[PDB]
Every structure is written in C-alpha cells, then in structure tokens.
Amino acid sequence: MLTVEVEVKITADDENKAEEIVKRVIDEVEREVQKQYPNATITRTLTRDDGTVELRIKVKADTEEKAKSIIKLIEERIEEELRKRDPNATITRTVRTEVGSSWSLEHHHHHH
C-alpha cells in the first residue's frame, strides 16, 4: 500500500463557494470509492486564498494507477459542479507524489 497526493490549484472568482462545492464532490465520490476500492482511503485538504483554492487529495491505495482512477472521478465532478456556480473556475492539476521505490536493489547470485 502506497499513498499518492494530487495538488490541484483552482483559480476561481468566488473561492468561498469553490471550496465547499469541491468538498461536496470529494465526500459523494469518497463514500462510493470505499465500496469499489475498499483498500483506498481518501483524505482531503483545501485552503482558500485571494481568488484561489489549493486542493490536495491524498489517496492511500494498493497502486497509484487505481488511485489515478479515483483522482479522475474527483476531477470530472469538481470541474462540472464548480463551473455551474462560477465559470471562472479553472483547475490546474499537479501530481504531488512522484511514485518512488523504483530502484530495486535486487542482489542475488545463488550457488547451486
């Protein structure tokens, strides 16, 4: 089990609504993801700013690929629902976790 974060910086005219709409999405997707991916735990961290909301979704899952699926469910719904109140909402997705432990120190020379 690995954890992966995605930091989506959202520029919006009404950041106050932007945050609350995204939260509504995260939770309505989360309850479904706990049934489809019972391994995958979603955590959310939003912080508002002068015409911005910094969204950080932390998905702890078996694989970051299946976690990318979960992130995409959140992406589609946050973008849709937010623009329905505020069309100024442009989201900028940046992956905060670059999946390490790539370098496998596989040392083996068995005498037979």
Side-chain angles (χ1 to χ4, degrees):
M1 179 182 294
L2 50 73
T3 313
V4 60
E5 292 190 73
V6 59
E7 186 176 291
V8 182
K9 184 176 180 179
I10 308 175
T11 185
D13 181 79
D14 198 299
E15 72 296 283
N16 185 91
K17 286 298 301 186
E19 184 186 72
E20 298 299 276
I21 296 173
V22 170
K23 289 173 173 169
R24 184 185 67 214
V25 167
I26 300 165
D27 188 70
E28 283 291 276
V29 175
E30 187 178 283
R31 53 182 288 213
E32 305 305 301
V33 167
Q34 302 305 327
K35 297 183 287 70
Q36 302 302 91
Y37 311 84
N39 184 272
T41 308
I42 305 178
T43 306
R44 70 288 288 271
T45 303
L46 297 75
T47 306
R48 298 187 300 224
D49 184 76
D50 186 86
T52 299
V53 182
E54 181 187 277
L55 171 63
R56 295 183 59 165
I57 297 295
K58 176 185 294 296
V59 184
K60 184 179 65 181
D62 175 79
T63 39
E64 52 75 65
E65 179 178 83
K66 298 183 65 181
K68 291 306 198 302
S69 178
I70 301 168
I71 296 172
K72 180 57 61 59
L73 271 55
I74 301 177
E75 288 177 70
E76 300 306 275
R77 294 283 63 218
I78 63 177
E79 175 177 64
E80 274 296 288
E81 294 292 276
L82 217 179
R83 296 184 192 252
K84 293 169 64 182
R85 171 59 190 89
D86 181 61
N88 300 270
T90 305
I91 73 292
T92 305
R93 187 188 65 182
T94 299
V95 67
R96 179 53 57 225
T97 303
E98 184 182 275
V99 53
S101 302
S102 52
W103 185 36
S104 311
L105 296 73
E106 185 183 276
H107 61 105
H108 62 123
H109 180 256
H110 300 110
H111 58 261
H112 48 91

